[PDB]
Automatic annotation (TrEMBL), chains A, B, C, D:
It comes from the Eukaryota. Belongs to the DapA family. One of its GO terms (biological process) is lysine biosynthetic process via diaminopimelate. It is an enzyme of class 4 (lyase). This is 4-hydroxy-tetrahydrodipicolinate synthase. Signal peptide: none annotated.
Length: 307, 307, 307, 307
């Protein structure tokens, strides 16, 4: 149901952990989703940008979606990132994603191979009939800012749940004033988006590391001292493009193996020493996992190009 | 060999024509490549941005690369667009592309799922050893500008042929002053890139339509009036994201079927009328094909989502 | 659990129904699985020989498996047919199959590209660790009778549930006397198999049509007259290779569309007239669906090659 | 043309060699094909049963086809095994194969998921329009003997080059007496097929090892003692299902790496010792490669399940 999605506040763009040979680490993955559920995350994006969907083959991706529904579908909402810059792929991945039982679809606009505003309408209308859909706007990554007019055109579909919006709180307000549910895509803006700009919540990267704190941040009420306290973490996580920092942090925490699928590559030593201090400053207990945080040696990391 | 690639002036990023069901129209494609050859185009990019590589499955792409080499490899240089935002795909497509006898690879930086500068080097160094390589910078599309420092780092490989640069002529000059071969990726800039900024040539969209005229611009010396003559065609070609304009124009010229793979959608009626006038002004004899240019009506066009 | 699969008695090799363009018709499929549940079937093979697994791409197949698990997993055992003549495919299909929550895998011996008995052991040991496994012997189709020595060798794995045996009741006896669970894969034999030869049950084609009668046959005691009654149906079902008859019969009953993926093709008119009389003799009320059975015209059937 | 294929007398079903990680070893492959050309083989089957087409993903397969055409097409006829038990795959693989320039297609009848005789005609008629076709009958592997009637039905197409026939010389004679070109697919029968039953040639496994000797058997009249001389090699090659013996023999000769894709596993030590004697008796100079034949130890062999 659409309204079940519209009412979600904390959705995690869950990271996809790997085995040393590059394959998904499903044991680690399950542990990750369990810690999300425990600390009150209400949804997960499967193979989003943070989940490195762009580096998956489709059978892996659909497997991971079906897996998450199968294991956790009764505790958390499952949102498959089945979007693509290719309409054919979007169509195919969306209908199969829904068939294995995902609750909603995340659809970005075609990136790289940008299309016209007419083309966008055609693209979204190809997948909107399939079920609850969250449209995903991230111009910094795609090359194209989806204008409000396009969002209003396709909002005629009952199946539009809302927008994962990344251009900023000004855009969110443009939408939330006009009866369109929005989740902030930026962790450094999402407190204000929720409390001041009418966002329903966040689709979050940082909730991978501190789900409990991100829950407190969105559920209880305004709280700038909590927002300020997590900000040094948030900044560290985005000095290089996401999910490079997240990947690096989760491995320092022991919850995932220090394995990267290329083109991503871990943060250097100096940055890794820094994270240890950010953890110490915020308190290890707020971070996922139980293991003492490590700095890790350069030689600990495994980069995979062929898998 | 790298020097054979370094000397090419006119490279056409060839359009990929479709059958009504959405499969490749090899009959129309073959005729397109021959018309490139007749008018002195020196190389082709297979499945580039213009060629809609982004919408192809890999079997189809490798097929088209091998087809092009088999039928035309003796008369024209074949450069497979085997780049990707995924290193695994880039590695895999590039070695398979070379195995079927392509002459060079075009490699963009990872788009959408952007990586760090360190990751860029890792990405590029995974494929440079395989053969002659052209690195492709188009930050409008990718969201990441490849810094000259990165280009200079990877230029330690003897397999770097040069750069398809899209940021502008001033960037081109930064490279050409420093021993780096550059092809302009901007038709509205390529005349001046060649004569004022040290560029070796162009990797062209517009040459799909007027290959003879583009050749003249790079081969004969500064010609401000020929350059001014093509400008209205170029401006038309890029009013919407390439290859929408090109796809539309080739259908109007009757050299391809009016079949579009989504998310692309033809230019509207008014622009199509405009194109008939543009052809008139420049002269029909300068455009590919023999058939009278048509406006085409809306319902002539076939939009393919499932293929 | 392995013991759970071992205690299954009535398992249906469910047919895979299609839409006019050759894609899976999930609406029809869901209704077929429900009718199996209502008349007591305890498990289903998904994409078996009868389910035309041979004609699926793996994305489609894992989708179907995950769909069946998601919709029916709590009411019925889902056995994914993840075997292949390629160990790589078998490995990959099986692990993905279990990850989306299938209860067991069906594993044939490599067919067409036959391997040595040693190769057979290597192949089965590649997949047995992954979960509960039914080994499928059908030398009339594979070209290779799996010898009991091989079965006894691989039976060292705690994950071997049993054998889907197609050679005959005397083979079955060899196994059941020696503590190996067996399901007959021959409908014309399965009654004797279960009552006289120790078979735990059947993996059935005919239950697709008359699940209630197949249940009665296997559950309520030795019944020579009931067995004799179904035999005209069973014989008709296998005049041409299965599932040609079943596909035809289900269309005639109106429970699936008259759509065939090639290389399969429907039974001719005279045979379809014959099916109407078999239905009248057994009684329409014993067959899946509510609609009057039809002969159907030759022109009703759609044959799909490209999908 | 079709006639160009019909006059071919010695065709090799070339082995596909692998690198330690399971990928194609194009360097070894190129040496194998070169050796075939040197000793007068006039065509190759690419990815046949002997070439382990059944273990290949389609992209590496079309790659290998396109590679063989690009590198050797001027010197040898390239026949892609694009046949399948799935008509969709057969259609798809065949046209893509011809697109990259293969000279003919090898087409088997659907194995394992066997179809009706009407089904077979449908299946073959989907691919016969694409290019010169060789129909492949080997019921010991398919479970279905293609009857003469089906061949005569499909022979109405001018694109039927002929039949690769494995059932025996008597079958060959029913065809050759009725204007249909045949290649024997049995090395132990091919001498007599040619000289006594009107076969045009062989499509050979054994020519992978001793191409010159096979040439002599087929181009130089009856020679029962040359024929008897090769027979112990042929018997050794087929004691376990082909290509297990050939893969083993080629490793021993050092012209390929001792690498197997599962389910295939090498012949045991005793047979390897036996091969060394077979080589001594026939004479090393007749076999491919210059290196001294080795026994090889169990330890040397690499079995790949995941690639
Ligand atoms: Br590790
Ligand atoms: Br462009
Ligand atoms: Br058309
Ligand atoms: Br009962
Ligand atoms: Br229908
Ligand atoms: Br009735
Ligand atoms: Br080796
Ligand atoms: Br020797
Ligand atoms: Cl953004
Ligand atoms: Cl600049
Ligand atoms: Cl059997
Ligand atoms: Cl027996
Ligand atoms: Cl045979």
């Amino acid at each position: 149901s659409v309204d079940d999605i519209k009412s979600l506040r904390l959705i995690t763009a869950i990271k996809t952990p790997y085995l040393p040979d590059g394959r998904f680490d499903l044991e680690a993955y399950d542990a990750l989703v369990n810690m999300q559920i425990v600390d009150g995350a209400e949804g997960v994006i499967v193979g989003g940008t943070t989940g490195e969907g762009q580096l998956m083959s489709w059978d892996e991706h659909i497997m991971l979606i079906g897996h998450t529904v199968n294991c956790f579908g009764g505790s958390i909402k499952v949102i498959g990132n089945t979007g693509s810059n290719s309409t054919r792929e979007a169509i195919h991945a969306t209908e199969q994603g829904f068939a294995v039982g995902m609750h909603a679809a995340l659809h970005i606009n075609p990136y790289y191979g940008k299309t016209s505003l007419e083309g966008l309408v055609s693209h979204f209308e190809s997948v909107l009939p399939m079920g609850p859909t969250v449209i995903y706007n991230v111009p910094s990554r795609t090359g194209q800012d989806i204008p409000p007019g396009v969002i209003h055109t396709v909002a005629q579909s009952a199946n539009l749940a809302g927008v994962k919006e990344c251009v900023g709180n000004d855009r969110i307000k443009q939408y939330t004033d006009n009866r369109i549910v929005v989740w902030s895509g930026n962790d450094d803006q999402c407190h204000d988006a929720k409390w001041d700009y009418g966002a329903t919540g966040v689709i979050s990267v940082t909730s991978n590391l501190i789900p409990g704190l991100m829950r407190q941040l969105l559920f209880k009420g305004k709280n700038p001292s909590l927002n300020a306290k997590i900000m040094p973490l948030v900044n560290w996580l985005f000095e290089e493009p996401n999910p490079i920092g997240l990947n690096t942090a989760l491995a320092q925490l022991g919850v995932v193996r220090p394995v990267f699928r290329l083109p991503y590559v871990p943060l250097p030593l100096a940055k890794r020493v820094e994270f240890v201090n950010i953890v110490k400053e915020i308190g290890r207990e707020n971070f996922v996992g139980e293991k003492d945080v490590k700095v890790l040696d350069d030689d600990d990391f495994i980069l995979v190009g062929r898998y």
